[PDB]
Amino acid sequence: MDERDAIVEIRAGTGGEEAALFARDLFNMYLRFAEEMGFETEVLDSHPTDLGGFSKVVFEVRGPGAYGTFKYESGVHRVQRVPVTETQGRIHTSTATVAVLPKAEEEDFALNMDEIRIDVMRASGPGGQGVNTTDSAVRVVHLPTGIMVTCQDSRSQIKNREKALMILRSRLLEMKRAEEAERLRKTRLAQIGTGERSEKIRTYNFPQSRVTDHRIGFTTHDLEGVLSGHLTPILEALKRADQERQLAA
């Protein structure tokens, strides 16, 4: 878990163009934090706002022990400043939603053909003397799930058996990569959620030069150094209160 390379998905929340600009400043905060750990960040998918921001940034943190630290940052982050997008000198609250996921496996598929049963029969339709006599039709019934692929496409049984297994595997994989996406989906809705001004994990209020992790109460005042990548104290101050979640009896 904590020792696998981990991928952080930075998005934009409420705020419009300034949410995407604050998300750009969270992007160069965990990337400058990367070399402050000897880690490796590879870009994967960015949607650059023409104003210099990102509506969505996805990067990796390739290093032995990334999900042991980045994991806390998953959640909604709050901003409140006078944006460069504002022209009446007013404070504007905006959000930028972060998601931290572990880089999973690209593991391949293969059929355990002891839980696979192959039925054979005569083919339904034309063919004359052949179709009435030849066992050209194949049904592969995946046993632990019940689903069945049939194939009487050609006249050959061994051709219609690969076309049946090929589709049995191709269909079983699209169901395996389906809960893989359902897990991937419900998990974000725990991290990101609605991304509204509430639900916040950390406020970066530029007026007061303060960065506050409201879930534990730790607040520093180095809002420039924190945004420059010195998030090590906030992670530690959550780390001590992380095992002070294990205080038993």
Using CB under 5 A, which residues numbered 1 to 30 contact Mg ion?
none
> Which range binds Mg ion by CB under 5 A, 50-58, 94-102, 140-148, 188-196?
50-58
Q: How far is the CB of 12 from RNA (least distance, A)?
A: 7
Tell me whether residue 6 is exposed, middle or buried, using C-beta atoms within 10 angstroms of its C-beta: 0 to 12, 13 to 18, 19 or more.
buried
Amino acid identity, position 225: G
Q: How far is the CB of 151 from RNA (least distance, A)?
A: 6
Q: How far is the CB of 100 from Mg ion (least distance, A)?
A: 17
The reply on whether position 123 binds Mg ion by CB under 5 A is yes
Contact of residue 191 among Mg ion, RNA, none (CB under 5-8 Å per partner type)? none
> Which range binds Mg ion by CB under 5 A, 31-39, 54-62, 166-174, 207-215?
54-62
Contact of residue 187 among Mg ion, RNA, none (CB under 5-8 Å per partner type)? none
Contact of residue 56 among Mg ion, RNA, none (CB under 5-8 Å per partner type)? Mg ion
Mention every residue, 6+ apart, whose C-beta is less than 8 A from residue 210.
203, 219, 220, 221, 223
CA 150 from centre of chain: 36
Q: Which is nearer to RNA, 102 or 116 (CB)?
A: 116
CB 157, CB 136: distance < 8 Å: yes
Facing residues of 120 across strands? 138
> By C-alpha distance, which of 48, 28, 31 is closest to 39?
31
Q: How far is the CB of 243 from RNA (least distance, A)?
A: 22
Q: How far is the CB of 28 from RNA (least distance, A)?
A: 6
The reply on whether position 122 binds Mg ion by CB under 5 A is yes
Cα separation, 149 vs 140, in Å, equals 5
The reply on whether position 157 binds Mg ion by CB under 5 A is no
Q: Which two tokens stand for residue 214?
A: 């409201």
Q: Which is nearer to Mg ion, 38 or 125 (CB)?
A: 125
Contact of residue 239 among Mg ion, RNA, none (CB under 5-8 Å per partner type)? none
> By C-alpha distance, which of 51, 44, 53, 49 is closest to 24?
53
Three-state secondary-structure class, residue 91:
coil
Among 37, 116, 131, 241, binds Mg ion (CB under 5 A): 131
Cα separation, 60 vs 11, in Å, equals 15
Binding site for Mg ion (CB under 5 A): 47, 55-56, 80, 87, 122-124, 131, 134, 136
